[model samples]
Target chain A: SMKNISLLYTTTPTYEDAYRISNILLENKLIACANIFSNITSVYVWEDEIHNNTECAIILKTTNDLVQHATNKIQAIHPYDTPAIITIDPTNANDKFIQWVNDCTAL
Target chain B: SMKNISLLYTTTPTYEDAYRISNILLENKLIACANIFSNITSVYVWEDEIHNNTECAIILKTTNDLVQHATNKIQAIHPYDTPAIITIDPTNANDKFIQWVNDCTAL
Candidate 1:
């Protein structure tokens, strides 16, 4: 069975921006936790042009119910015009940690 | 059809510990690659009281078939009583990277 977990992935132009976005979500209780990765090399095509950039990525863990709210808040503050905001559903996790997620993110 | 892939998430108390966990999996061919993020802040309840701690997180890319094996191996050496081992089915990813993952993690 799929759990009520969602991992939202996105990239920021810099590490500072990535952490800034994540902390906002944490302070708002929109996510139980956020992990930020720095010095990520990303390659993609945008507007018919290929672009390669050094970026920082963020993975915010929250329940499925808060996905929309969290995404909206992220988009509102995100710098990218069309930021890569994607969701993944976890199949399983430790019971205690999942309960921690559900508890911390309760609205 | 869903891709034959998985994104596993776990955390260690320190950055070195996180990298050590990932490198072993990478070296053993149990995972295609791993991403380690440092300076993560985790908040959770333990024994009914909330605790906040700094942690490092790791995400390992592997196939669905290897999930069980990888998880078992991770648990074998993980330091915590019950580590936050989780699996997520990625609905989407970069096609090239997916191919890379398939190639790198082939048995």
Candidate 2:
């Protein structure tokens, strides 16, 4: 079922950071694939101050069973005190793509 | 509730397409904010052929109530015949961020 699939969204300080993290997750079989986007502008309020920063975003595909484990590992190695590691449940997905992801992350 | 917040993920053929679509969504108040990433490489199979294409991705933040509306608008204006429009329900989000998104899309 597609319900067993998960999409993890995360932001990193730099393209290199995102690249390194994606590799780690892939190597560990925590994610099937990672799509990285660079030069993303994120504006938000932090500590009562509005800040605009350039960051890299990663979209990770994995199984639901591995979501928490992947999140924990990302936080442990992440640079930010509070990294934006959010799990997004995809409501729709292609069956072939879903099967590919599952196979890639199979234990 | 964070459940009311949605993170829409879609891909476009170019940065300009993403930028144009994002502006339209924001102008229509369908999305609070858009984060665009350029030069993303997508590898997938289509019609029994392996294809590697360069694309741009957009992460759009909006309220859950407007997901269908926003999606329809995106599809109508999108350049691709079959765009990769996916709705992701964020499992976790900052309260303030959620509020901000709600306000941005408020009627």
Candidate 3:
């Protein structure tokens, strides 16, 4: 029941690109685990037009303390010009998951 | 850093069921954009059971004003008795994205 839990999400044109960033986050101990989807439909507006495309997405679980650092690192590594780097705070996260995150991302 | 932003997420067993509710939200302007994953692994507990299974998830972006309405709507329409209808507040969000959410989900 730790309030330090954070959920981070982002999308890429391909799964490889998404996995590449995920690997770095894991290797650097910035996150505990990542859930990756190889195929997903993304609908958004750009340049006054609605663009829909297929893409890959990844969500990472980590401590709130490392959210900013993880966000910055993802931005640096992601290929997209404007990656969807969003963070969410969970209300009722499990105790073990938070502990796992703390253990993995500990400095 | 306008903080009038919110995110909503939930998971379902099938993609069709996920999209069924997503379309309703879009049609009713409850949410501007929804990103749905067709396939992903979810690890969680139920009745003292830890199960890892394939599932679909949807993340909706809307103004802070409509998050509660959208959450309730999804719960009512969603088949799962206990869907993961999580809401998040964004610290920093793109102006256009927030504006788009407002425009699409305006009452």
Candidate 3, true inter-chain contacts retained: 0.35
Per-residue lDDT value at B107 in model 2: 71
Which candidate ranks first by lDDT, i.e. highest? 2
The C-alpha lDDT values of all candidates are 0.81, 0.81, 0.78
Clashes of each: 0, 0, 0
Flag regions of model 3 displaced more than 4 Å: A1-3, A47-49, A92-96, B1-3, B10-30, B39-57, B68-107
Off by over 4 Å in 2: A1-37, A41-53, A58-85, A89-107, B1-3
lDDT for A60 (candidate 3): 87
Error of 2 at B24 (Å): 0.6
Residue pairs in clash, model 3: none
lDDT of 1 by residue, B1-107 (tens): 12378988899999888888898898888999888878766654445444567788888999888887888888887888667788987777887877777788786
Between prediction 2 and prediction 3, the one with superior DockQ is 3
Q: At residue B23, what lDDT does model 1 achieve?
A: 85
How would you encode candidate 1's per-residue C-alpha lDDT over A33-73 as one tens digit per residue?
A: 77666688999997999999999877788889899999999
